[PDB]
Structures are given as C-alpha cells and as structure tokens.
Design a protein around this ligand. Structure first.
Ligand SMILES: [Mn+2]
Ligand SMILES: [Mn+2]
Ligand SMILES: [Mn+2]
Ligand SMILES: [Mn+2]
Ligand SMILES: [Mn+2]
Ligand SMILES: [Mn+2]
Ligand SMILES: [Mn+2]
Ligand SMILES: [Mn+2]
Ligand SMILES: [Mn+2]
Ligand SMILES: [Mn+2]
Ligand SMILES: [Mn+2]
Ligand SMILES: [Mn+2]
Length: 276
C-alpha cells in the first residue's frame, strides 16, 4: 500500500492523477516522448506491469499494445479498468476496408463530456479496489469534472456566431470527431485512410480532389507527431490550416489534459471566428 495504477496514454495520466492526488501512484506503461501509434511492446515496460495493482485502459482501440504487454507480463490476470465502458462510441471509418470495414473511433479522450464519463468510471472502479480512498476519489473526480465543464463553457463563450452552413472541416488524423461534436460540427473528411496510416500518393490526390469538390474550408493537422504531406494539401487545395493536439507528446502531468484541451477548443473557436 499505496495503489500502483498503470496508464497507457497521456490523457489517462491526467484523469487518474486528478482522481487520486497523493492517495496512489500513477505509473505510465510506455515512455514519455514515445508515439503511441508507433509503439511496439518492449520487455523493459512489460517488466514493470508486475509492480502494478490495476491498469487503466482506453480499451476501444487506442492501446491494444497494453493488452499484449499485460498478457506477456508476470500479472496477466491483473485487474483492468475499461475507462470507456459507459462512453457512447462514434463509428468513424476505417481501419481501411480489406482489414476491418467500419470500426469505432477510439479518441473518446478528446471529448470533454466523454472525458467526464471516463473520469467517473475510473474513480468508481478505483473506489472498489481502494475502499478507504473511495470518498476522496469521488470528491476529486467531481471537482475535476467541474473544471473540465468550465474549460468548454469559457471557450464557447468566445464564439459570437455559430458556423455557417457551408463551413466544412477536415482533419489529417481521425482524432477530433468527438471534440468537434462539442460544437455541433461534423468532420467532412479524414486524410489518413485508417488510424495512424499514411495515405498513398493516389489516396492523397483523391482526398485533395474531394476537399476541392466539397468546398472544405479548414483542415486540422497534428502538433504532436506532424506529417510530411500537409504542406502538399496546402499547396494543392487552398484550404486554411489549423493544428490540434492529440495529447500524446512530451512529459506526463496532471495538468496536461486540461492545458492542451483548452488550446484545442480555442483553436476550433479561432477557425470558426476566422470563417466570418
Ligand atoms: Mn490500497
Ligand atoms: Mn476493474
Ligand atoms: Mn482535482
Ligand atoms: Mn479513426
Ligand atoms: Mn490517434
Ligand atoms: Mn454533429
Ligand atoms: Mn464529426
Ligand atoms: Mn477514410
Ligand atoms: Mn504520401
Ligand atoms: Mn474534383
Ligand atoms: Mn499533420
Ligand atoms: Mn506531474
């Protein structure tokens, strides 16, 4: 004792740290500065799972590497918190065609409302494991949710007018479908054919031709692990470029999620305000 809680992605470090405080230890599975899309399990990181009591998973497609790390560890039967067990999932593409047709968008963590649902699931499941700190977990979860709710409200407060009917939005990476739904907006197109997959020159050309035909106004690119082909899209479509954070780069911290979500929500507001 204390509880040793494993995490996979940076947003989950933030949720858990804000729920536990000093009552437990938040242990990242994979190193800081690693790209979760590129990550291939290492004996190094698999060997630390044996020191944990519970692992908090996204479990809906953004941390399959962790399910394999646990399976290859000293604790293959380690208690697991399915953080998205009560989150309604969007079925955004793709995962391609001749692999898996229509799948689930695993970026629930890039939503304020689905974040609050995840925070509540984690605080309840940790409460069941650590009954002595169940009250503190719940108190801290409610207070974190109030700050997440205020973050969204204060960002939307900056929006004078709703986007026009012709306001179409595209993204490089299919991470922002949940974020944009907070504005009542839909992503017209995703450039990546499947999650974390680079398009072929022919696939990129077809997409550029679709952004031009569909009159897409703005494109949301990556700050974290940027792509080489975004300037080609700029050079061929005449679409305005804005960048968003996937909350996957740098050091793990409690504040990281709310710091980067505030910047994301302000970038989306700036993109709307700059449409008129
Ligand atoms: Mn304990
Ligand atoms: Mn559990
Ligand atoms: Mn808090
Ligand atoms: Mn996707
Ligand atoms: Mn992703
Ligand atoms: Mn919508
Ligand atoms: Mn959408
Ligand atoms: Mn696609
Ligand atoms: Mn390419
Ligand atoms: Mn065309
Ligand atoms: Mn990019
Ligand atoms: Mn910290």
């Amino acid at each position: 004792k204390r509880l040793r809680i494993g995490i996979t992605l940076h947003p989950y470090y933030s949720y858990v740290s804000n729920i536990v405080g000093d009552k437990a230890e938040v242990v990242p599975l994979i190193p800081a500065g690693f790209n979760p899309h590129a990550y291939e399990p290492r004996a190094e990181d698999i060997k630390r799972i044996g020191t944990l009591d519970v692992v908090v998973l996204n479990g809906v497609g953004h941390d399959d590497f962790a399910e394999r790390m646990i399976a290859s560890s000293e604790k293959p039967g380690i208690p697991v918190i399915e953080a998205n067990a009560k989150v309604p999932l969007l079925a955004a593409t793709g995962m391609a065609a001749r692999g898996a047709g229509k799948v689930v968008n695993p970026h629930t963590f890039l939503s304020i409302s689905a974040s609050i649902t995840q925070v509540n699931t984690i605080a309840r499941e940790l409460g069941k494991l650590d009954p002595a700190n169940a009250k503190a977990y719940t108190r801290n979860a409610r207070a974190y949710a109030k700050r997440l709710r205020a973050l969204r409200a204060d960002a939307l407060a900056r929006l004078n007018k709703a986007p026009a009917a012709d306001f179409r939005v595209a993204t490089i990476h299919g991470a922002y479908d949940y974020l944009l739904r907070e504005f009542g907006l839909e992503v017209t197109a995703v450039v990546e054919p499947a999650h974390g997959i680079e398009p072929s020159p022919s696939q990129l050309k077809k997409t550029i031709d679709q952004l031009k035909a569909l009159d897409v106004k703005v494109i949301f690119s990556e700050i974290d692990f940027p792509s080489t082909y975004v300037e080609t899209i700029q050079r061929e479509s005449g679409v305005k470029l804005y960048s968003l954070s996937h909350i996957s780069y740098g050091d793990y911290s409690a504040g990281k999620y709310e710091e980067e979500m505030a910047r994301n929500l302000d970038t989306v507001v700036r993109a709307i305000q700059e449409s008129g």
